[PDB]
Amino acid sequence: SVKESVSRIPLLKTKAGPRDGDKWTARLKEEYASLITYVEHNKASDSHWFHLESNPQGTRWYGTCWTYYKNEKYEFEMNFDIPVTYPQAPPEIALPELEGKTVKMYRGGKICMTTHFFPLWARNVPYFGISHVLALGLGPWLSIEVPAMVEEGYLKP
């Protein structure tokens, strides 16, 4: 379902990052279009798992993401900035509440995503966006680590 969820996320056409003026605005429109479709698809399969806002420039993002385990909801604050060399470089996603609760994380509560993520990103630049980072990066990270932490005793209802 993860691979086929991703197969229905809209791809992006524009190679631009935050420094690129009108092309960034056009890139952001595609970002928003991809995100909205992904969220609608998630809602219709009753698998909605994040809420995101950003500043007007689309360069700083913040909100929450959540996962269910043993029928219970675990929700976390999340944030990421869009690098100036985006979309070559994907953003680094932070979940600051989780620092020290898992080793799969580095300086600033930034998650250590799967080894497989980065080569997959690199060869699909610029057609992947934020929606893909969440679907391929953050989503899988949550599904593996949160159960560990819930079971280790760092997390409760």
Ordered domains of the chain (ranges, CATH): 1-157 (3.10.110.10)
Do residues 152 and 69 lie in contact, with contact meaning Cβ atoms separated by under 8 Å? no
Would you give the DSSP letter of residue 66?
E
As a whole number of angstroms, the distance between CA 24 and CA 113 comes to: 26
Residue 132's nearest CA partner among 30, 26, 23 is: 30
The technique is X-ray
Q: Tell me, in Å, the resolution of the deposited structure.
A: 2.2
As a whole number of angstroms, the distance between CA 90 and CA 92 comes to: 7
As a whole number of angstroms, the distance between CA 41 and CA 10 comes to: 11
Would you give the DSSP letter of residue 94?
B
Is residue 112 flagged as an active site residue? yes
Out of 112, 120, 148, 150, the active site residue is 112
As a whole number of angstroms, the distance between CA 98 and CA 53 comes to: 20
Backbone region of residue 80 per phi and psi (left: phi > 0; alpha: psi in -120 to 50; beta: other values): beta
